[PDB]
Amino acid sequence: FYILVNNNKRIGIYYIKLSIIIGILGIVLSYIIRVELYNSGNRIIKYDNVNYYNMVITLHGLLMIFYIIMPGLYGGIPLYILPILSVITDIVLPRINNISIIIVLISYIVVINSIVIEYNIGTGWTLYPPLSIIGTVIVNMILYGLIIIGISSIISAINFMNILIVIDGIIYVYIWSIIITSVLLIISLPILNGILLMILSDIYFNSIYFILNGDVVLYQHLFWYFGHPEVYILILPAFGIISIILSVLNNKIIFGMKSMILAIIMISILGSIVWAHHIYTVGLELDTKIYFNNLTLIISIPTGNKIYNWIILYIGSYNILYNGYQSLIFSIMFIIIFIIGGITGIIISIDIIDIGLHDTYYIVSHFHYILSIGAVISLLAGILLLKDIIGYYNVIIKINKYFGLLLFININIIFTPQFIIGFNVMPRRILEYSDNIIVWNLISSIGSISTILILLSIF
Amino acid sequence: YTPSFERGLNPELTSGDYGDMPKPQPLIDFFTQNRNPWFGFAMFCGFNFLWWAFFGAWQIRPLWASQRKSLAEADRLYGPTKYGVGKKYIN
Amino acid sequence: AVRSQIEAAVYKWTRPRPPRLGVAVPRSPPGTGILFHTNMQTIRYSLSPKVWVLVTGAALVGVFSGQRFAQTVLLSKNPPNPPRYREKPPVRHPHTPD
Amino acid sequence: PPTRLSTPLYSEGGAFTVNWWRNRYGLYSRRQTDPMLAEFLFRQQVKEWFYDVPSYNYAALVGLALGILVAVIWRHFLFNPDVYVRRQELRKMWPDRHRQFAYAVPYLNPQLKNLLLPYKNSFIDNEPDYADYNPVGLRPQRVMAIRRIPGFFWAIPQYFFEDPLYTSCSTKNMQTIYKKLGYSEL
Amino acid sequence: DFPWRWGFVAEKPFWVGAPILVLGVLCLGHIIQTMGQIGVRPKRYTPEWVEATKERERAENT
Amino acid sequence: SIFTPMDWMFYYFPNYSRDKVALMARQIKIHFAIGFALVFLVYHPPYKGADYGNFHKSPLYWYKYNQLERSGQLQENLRIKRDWFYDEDP
Amino acid sequence: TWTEIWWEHDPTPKVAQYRPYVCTVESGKVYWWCACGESKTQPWVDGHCKCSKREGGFRPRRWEPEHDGVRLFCGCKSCFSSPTWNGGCFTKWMQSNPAGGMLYCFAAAFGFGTLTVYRKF
Amino acid sequence: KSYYDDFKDRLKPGKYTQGRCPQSEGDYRQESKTIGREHLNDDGTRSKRYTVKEADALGYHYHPPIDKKGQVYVKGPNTVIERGQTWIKGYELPSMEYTYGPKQEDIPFYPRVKLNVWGNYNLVMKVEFLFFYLPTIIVFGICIPVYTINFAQEEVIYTTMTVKVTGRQWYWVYEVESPT
Amino acid sequence: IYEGQTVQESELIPQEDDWVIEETNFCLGRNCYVRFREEDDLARRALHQMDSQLNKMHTRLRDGTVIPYMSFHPDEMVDRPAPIHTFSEKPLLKWTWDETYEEAYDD
């Protein structure tokens, strides 16, 4: 059979396959954006059809996060190797594992069908009210997808937590990363469901939470209470993969295993109580802003320890071993890229600096370096490491120095200018812009078209 | 390109019979890769990408000569007064 | 001539003494010679602590001495700003309706 | 860390000790099925986690972060005027909430604000004392600090009396310049 | 075991092919996006409009 | 302990650190109190810290201050360099 | 200094040259590198040195290029990336002549400081 | 040498694209009629009947493997008795040339070496300490500036003029006090 | 931290003056994509794949003992590609201790 299969390793493959398929739509949406931003004036989107652009950015953000990266890093690799890293045979809850991947597909079909049938309007991937609750039915459809996706995420989190009961070996660092990510989902998802229901209530049940005398900022607190743990849920599995790749490909025992494990735990605890650095410009109390700013900076301490522990893993490795394997290059590239993304995150953590850089392309570049480069490269690196175990072929990616170099150069061309544009300044979620920002936007656009061409070379 | 034989700091250690094994060469060969024209083309290439990445494409300047001149005149005639070396810069 | 004397003096003073091992290892049996071969994974050649300091110290002097050289010879100081005189602003904004 | 089960582990009395940890570690464990095996696994975990020197660094960090977290939460409820828990003031119109207004001024003047506000001149180059004077009296009059903020502020001199232009850029001098022209009052 | 395209590329030295590919890919990207705007001449980029902006900047001391 | 490598704590204070589990708890408790104390003793106290007439002047302050005071730099530094907007055009 | 002061049970090479040997190499051909510094066909084994005779722990070092080109080969016989050169020849020279190393490092540092300061300033 | 030439003979270039003739010439979709291959298609792939339509996991072709005595066939080891001892000779995998193709000669030498481990416990602990507190010191250096700038934003100022700004879709409305 | 096994001086004394560390090659050989035979059907290609497993390979020392393929994690212990059912017999994680009981010995 193909749909009835409960084998966890098969389901892991399905997660990877589905993420690539949905990735194409996400890439298409991303390509539409940079083509439009090539220069001032409409290029592929009519001025009378600006609503479509708002939908493109809204779906680009939603699909890439919930439908592409999260299934790939939290559903794909973990379902394949996690029961193997544990001494157990298969996943604890086989039937739940089957329904989780099916749920992800159905939610994807609902989302894309809504593009085709409903009027195309957008409110951003964060769905801030009141804009989200004064829109058309496409917003209702997107909410159903998120709620449905939430069901799959929570049941998958329950599945991984049960490994603690049955694990017959040692809890490796990678296993810890998945377990702690599951803990974050369990504590953050129910809060997300509650606020999403309130959005539906206003949209569909004549609720008045998001009109005058009802604080709209209420949504931002509850949403970001899940929002920031989500970004840490995306990256923590990537950290686990990097730890395995560096140790395995260098024949070096992981240094400071317990320090690595405690760093992951510390990040989750801190990541659950710093959500309001997304709300600096709303006008919070003085003491509130100081607290979140102070605690946000503290997240760098555990994150820094992991970076240094990774570096010493690569240092001193035997020279005779060939170092040009794509998996090793991607793992090393992650350290270089993540540091850039994290440092810029610390810059925008300072709230007064953030006043100028909120809702600008500097924030875009910040999370693209971490997610579009780092997370993707970590997912690529893990899949490459498991090529023999997974057994896929008909691609030239294992030893391809051209692909690694071209990818690194061109992605940096896309997003380095966006840091510069942030100070110029160019707002986010914008289709037109002043003529004097064209040069930097043009350079990034040339970077985007180049990256897409490179992907065709792997086949 | 029939490269030369560099004996080295200690000529005695390069005094044996090399047979078919390659013989040591001057260091200039390494930087030219034995004057491979494609290394020299890929070399001219290397400098172009570097230049674009740090200073922009200066190969478009010959086509931008006429429109740059008009921009310079506009700044001098109508733009805010420049002082000293500031006159050298036009936005 | 002077270079040779100073070169010899630094060479003699920098010859390393046996390390004070920070790990618990046995004493090699007396009369034990070479047992391994050159195909073993290469072990990086590391400078002794004295040599590392001297070389590293020289670079620090070089880099900052070069910085001072550029600032005093290659670069120039700002001349005083031009005097500020009362000027006539434009009569009208170019977009003022007529 | 002993390597023989015959040698006992020293334990203190209290709610977080070796004995306290042993009693609870194996409550949910399927692997600690007999004394010998249970002790071996218990000492294995204790050795791996509690005898790891770098682990104690994270223990300090979680304590500090949680301590701040609890204090800020508690401070808002206790002192923030805008936070209501009792209902007496919420049953009256705004002008009648006299008891709640008592929190306003003291909550507006925390110690740290008074200490650090004078150090604005480490950031602002021109007129760092533009907002120092306020005749209303809700806050103290501010006086610029005499030293730079410790840390990463190497751009400015260590003390402001070393800067030849510091006094010329003060709000007082600029006010003198513009008043001489009749340009503005401030 | 590889198609012609990879056998051709993988035969050359990496630092011979790599710099050429980087330049080539960037040039192709620029050319592709320039196709849709051949001969487009907005008025705001004409010399007359450029001068007017300079007049505005002088008046506004931008 | 604060800013202390615990290997030093293990070595120099064996009896105190004999119970590692208890030692870990004290590490958490001690740093919890510090964080709690900072908010309510350093930040919270109202109407305090406004005695700007009592700025601390460390010995390094006086060393540099006296050095410039001895010469004319201190007087020159404090002098207002410019108090007019426009220069006179000849 | 691993062989010199730390470990006395690994073979210790003789420095043939404190500079790399430039050689043209061909893909699909195997080369043998002298690890003792006494071969007369440097940087390759000549058939008469210790490496060729398998004497005193010295053995030839197998090497094969991926692509055709000109490559640098270790002459100091202690480069971490041996047979290929990575700069260990200069490092090992500084150990032998630390006074000279200071002069070179100072000069290199001086140039780097001037250029970096001049451009940024 | 070129190792590909050693096993060139084994690799005969293919005839059909993707390894199959057109279904009209040969119907690879049908189940094979060869005895003992009823579970396979003609081209060798597993038949849909075997894997889907009549899958044993669904109750088709019920055949318990275990026998009455609770035993299943097990292949014994290759035992040898010599020197007054019973020995077992392990099964060695075939030469990698047979499975992969390249001739197993001129293999580069990779010696045995034990794990590369960082030593000097005392030194290592200090490095771990620095990894934690060097970032902490940097954070402390930022903290004081952060407090100061936050206070500057919220400082109470003696403003003399008020401008009210209202955001609407999609324009800005400004309300100002008209002079008397 | 782990710094290798502890060694006593007596353990380093050789029984002959000509002893040197054995030069046994731990490179398993030259490999590439597993190359199947067109004549082999699905069943026999499966046998071919099972006979090309690197994790079933080892290096035999001079005393007859073998150092096998080893990995830090059990992910490298299953057949490549991973079969449907991997760990039919539970992998054993061997711990060591100094405890002993009399029943195991005989005098």
Ligand SMILES: CCCCCCCCCCCCCCCCCC(=O)OC[C@H](COP(=O)([O-])OCC(O)COP(=O)([O-])OC[C@@H](COC(=O)CCCCCCCCCCCCCCCCC)OC(=O)CCCCCCCCCCCCCCCCC)OC(=O)CCCCCCCCCCCCCCCCC
């Ligand atoms: C009290 C009141 C009472 C009221 C009573 C009222 C009753 C009402 C009843 C209501 C319920 C009705 C439904 C009941 C279901 C019953 C299930 C059951 O028991 O089945 C047994 C039955 C067993 O079958 P069988 O009879 O033994 O025969 C099976 C075969 O012989 C061989 O066996 P097999 O299982 O191997 O074969 C199946 C499989 C075999 O075929 C294959 O698998 C083909 C090979 C793979 C090719 C590569 C595919 C791409 C990679 C995907 C990777 C991820 C896969 C994840 C796992 C699979 C998820 C489906 O083919 C399919 O079934 C189709 C596979 C589809 C894969 C989809 C992958 C993603 C596609 C992405 C699309 C991107 C474009 C976007 C736009 C389009 C969006 C739609 O199940 C099946 O095998 C068939 C299931 C068919 C139902 C599927 C329904 C899907 C609905 C989707 C939502 C559509 C809504 C929106 C429409 C929009 C259109 C544009």
Ligand SMILES: CCCCCCCCCCCCCCCCCC(=O)OC[C@H](COP(=O)([O-])OCC(O)COP(=O)([O-])OC[C@@H](COC(=O)CCCCCCCCCCCCCCCCC)OC(=O)CCCCCCCCCCCCCCCCC)OC(=O)CCCCCCCCCCCCCCCCC
């Ligand atoms: C701006 C000029 C642009 C020129 C156009 C571009 C031309 C192509 C250049 C390609 C270079 C590729 C190098 C290999 C990759 C690097 C990997 C690596 O480091 O590992 C090697 C190796 C590791 O062991 P391995 O196993 O043998 O190597 C593994 C490979 O990855 C295995 O990789 P594989 O299998 O592909 O094999 C690669 C193999 C074969 O490699 C090759 O085929 C490359 C051969 C060298 C070609 C260099 C041509 C330079 C042309 C400069 C033209 C300047 C004028 C431009 C116009 C200006 C107009 C104003 O590489 C080697 O044998 C390694 C040689 C050591 C690295 C040498 C890199 C520096 C070369 C000299 C650059 C000079 C730039 C001057 C700029 C002045 C501007 C005014 O050791 C090292 O890591 C080497 C340490 C670094 C040594 C070089 C230090 C830099 C040179 C001095 C400063 C130059 C800048 C001065 C600026 C002054 C401004 C006023």
Ligand SMILES: CCCCCCCCCCCCCCCCCC(=O)OC[C@H](COP(=O)([O-])OCC(O)COP(=O)([O-])OC[C@@H](COC(=O)CCCCCCCCCCCCCCCCC)OC(=O)CCCCCCCCCCCCCCCCC)OC(=O)CCCCCCCCCCCCCCCCC
């Ligand atoms: C004034 C108030 C006073 C109140 C006093 C209250 C007193 C309460 C006493 C409590 C005593 C607990 C005793 C049991 C200890 C645990 C034993 C255990 O689990 O046995 C294994 C047992 C399986 O039996 P087994 O066969 O022995 O297992 C063999 C191993 O798998 C094979 O593994 P292996 O042999 O390789 O390694 C052994 C060990 C290896 O692991 C360990 O040994 C870990 C040891 C440390 C654990 C933490 C202890 C507390 C540390 C101090 C924290 C103080 C914070 C103070 C804050 C104050 C603020 C005001 O494995 C495990 O422990 C596996 C389970 C780990 C679960 C972790 C879940 C995430 C929690 C966060 C981690 C802890 C972070 C602490 C802070 C870090 C920063 C400093 O596990 C299970 O039964 C699994 C059940 C899974 C259920 C999941 C769903 C639960 C519902 C979730 C709701 C949301 C949770 C949100 C969490 C947020 C986290 C950030």
Ligand SMILES: CCCCCCCCCCCCCCCCCC(=O)OC[C@H](COP(=O)([O-])OCC(O)COP(=O)([O-])OC[C@@H](COC(=O)CCCCCCCCCCCCCCCCC)OC(=O)CCCCCCCCCCCCCCCCC)OC(=O)CCCCCCCCCCCCCCCCC
């Ligand atoms: C004498 C020379 C000059 C000395 C200067 C001294 C300065 C003071 C330092 C202290 C004194 C040092 C004295 C050392 C004495 C020797 C001691 C010793 O033991 O010697 C033997 C010892 C070992 O000997 P051995 O064991 O025999 O092996 C020797 C081998 O050669 C193996 O050697 P190795 O393995 O040690 O090789 C080292 C190599 C190893 O490095 C790696 O392996 C790196 C691998 C990752 C590469 C990542 C590339 C970048 C990625 C960017 C991401 C975005 C991509 C965008 C793409 C766009 C599209 C194309 O390091 C590097 O390549 C340097 C990387 C430095 C960071 C790079 C990033 C700079 C960012 C700056 C801020 C930018 C702000 C921008 C603002 C706007 C624009 C202005 O060797 C050394 O210690 C060698 C040290 C030499 C280091 C020189 C590095 C210079 C780099 C300058 C960067 C300038 C940046 C300018 C822009 C600034 C803007 C603000």
Ligand code: HEA
């Ligand atoms: C995987 C995704 C991911 C990850 C890991 C992070 C990690 C971090 N993020 Fe990010 N972030 C996003 C995804 C992510 N973020 C997204 C998607 C948004 C925009 C959402 C939206 O608005 O739509 C965002 C937005 C965002 C904002 C602005 C929110 C707004 O106002 O709009 C800020 C502000 O501080 C921030 C901070 C941080 C910090 C401080 C970290 C830290 O974890 C980084 C820590 C890492 C380092 C610091 C580098 C490693 C450490 C060292 C090299 C040594 C120690 C360094 C120091 C002490 C400085 N993030």
Ligand code: HEA
């Ligand atoms: C995982 C998340 C993810 C990923 C990969 C990307 C990838 C890219 N994104 Fe981004 N993007 C977001 C998440 C992501 N993005 C979010 C959350 C926003 C904010 C939404 C909002 O404004 O509300 C955003 C916003 C955003 C904007 C701002 C829109 C606006 O405000 O007007 C732009 C503009 O160019 C952009 C461009 C790109 C480009 C050019 C790429 C890529 O082309 C970069 C290079 C990548 C490739 C060439 C494809 C590589 C392959 C994969 C990524 C799939 C791999 C799959 C597997 C391994 C299974 N993105």
Ligand SMILES: CCCCCCCC/C=C\CCCCCCCC(=O)OC[C@H](COP(=O)(O)OCCN)OC(=O)CCCCCCC/C=C/CCCCCCCC
């Ligand atoms: C949320 C409102 C729910 C109302 C419930 C009513 C029932 C009351 C009993 C149960 C709830 C506990 C609160 C009881 C309070 C009794 C005393 C009282 O009235 O206090 C009021 C006073 C403020 O009221 P006002 O005077 O109107 O405001 C002045 C300016 N801010 O309330 C408080 O300060 C107490 C409210 C908070 C109590 C809970 C504890 C606060 C700290 C939580 C820390 C959380 C972080 C983690 C802690 C870890 C601890 C191990």
Ligand SMILES: CCCCCCCC/C=C\CCCCCCCC(=O)O[C@H](COC(=O)CCCCCCC/C=C/CCCCCCCC)COP(=O)(O)OCCN
């Ligand atoms: C039987 C099990 C019961 C479990 C119940 C659990 C309940 C809590 C679940 C999580 C939700 C937390 C409540 C949400 C708190 C929101 C507070 C908020 O947004 O307030 C901020 C101010 O809040 C703060 O100062 C931030 C404090 C951070 C609160 C975090 C609480 C939840 C933390 C959960 C982290 C995970 C658990 C950690 C456990 C210990 C780890 C060691 C807004 O301030 P202003 O808009 O300026 O208004 C001020 C006056 N006008």
Ligand SMILES: [O-][O-]
């Ligand atoms: O979100 O960072």
Ligand SMILES: [Cu+2]
């Ligand atoms: Cu965040």
Ligand SMILES: [K+]
């Ligand atoms: K546009």
Ligand SMILES: [Zn+2]
């Ligand atoms: Zn030799």
Ligand SMILES: [Zn+2]
């Ligand atoms: Zn060398």
